[PDB]
Design a protein around this ligand. Structure first.
Ligand code: ZN
Ligand code: ZN
Ligand code: ZN
Lengths: 80, 6
């Protein structure tokens, strides 16, 4: 077993999130967001039509040149 | 992509 992995921290609020369900930016390993911070990003970005990386840096989908966006099902899980 | 939710 394991008591805990090495510490990993929310990019925006600095809270520990290793070994939890959190949002991992596909193309930037250090971009990690807890669900509370992600909820804020979804609400603030939602009016544009798409929700991109909560860092605001429009990080790409891996292998592509366009920013990755949340899926509807992920928004549902995060807002639950 | 896989889900962004870990
Ligand atoms: Zn062990
Ligand atoms: Zn956070
Ligand atoms: Zn990112």
């Amino acid at each position: 077993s394991l008591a805990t992995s090495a510490p990993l921290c929310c990019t925006l609020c600095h809270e520990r999130l290793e070994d939890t369900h959190f949002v991992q930016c596909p193309s930037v390993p250090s971009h990690k967001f807890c669900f509370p911070c992600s909820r804020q990003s979804i609400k603030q970005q939602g009016a544009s039509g798409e929700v991109y990386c909560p860092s605001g840096e429009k990080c790409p989908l891996v292998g592509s040149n366009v920013p990755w966006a949340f899926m509807q099902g992920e928004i549902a899980t995060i807002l639950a | 992509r896989p889900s962004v939710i870990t």
